């Protein structure tokens, strides 16, 4: 489980996926992380 702080970052982040950037480049540039919460927390709502 991976978590945006925006449905912004997660757009950056399915970008960075589609970008030879990796999962945690994506994770870093974008500022997504991975939970194994519930859900996406009140820090990454996306």
Do not use: E, M, W
């Not at 990796?22 to 919460?37: K, R």
């Amino acid at each position: 489980k991976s978590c945006c702080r925006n449905t912004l970052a997660r757009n950056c982040y399915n970008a960075c996926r589609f970008t030879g950037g990796s999962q945690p480049t994506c994770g870093i540039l974008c500022d997504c992380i991975h939970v194994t919460t519930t859900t996406c927390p009140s820090s990454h709502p996306s």
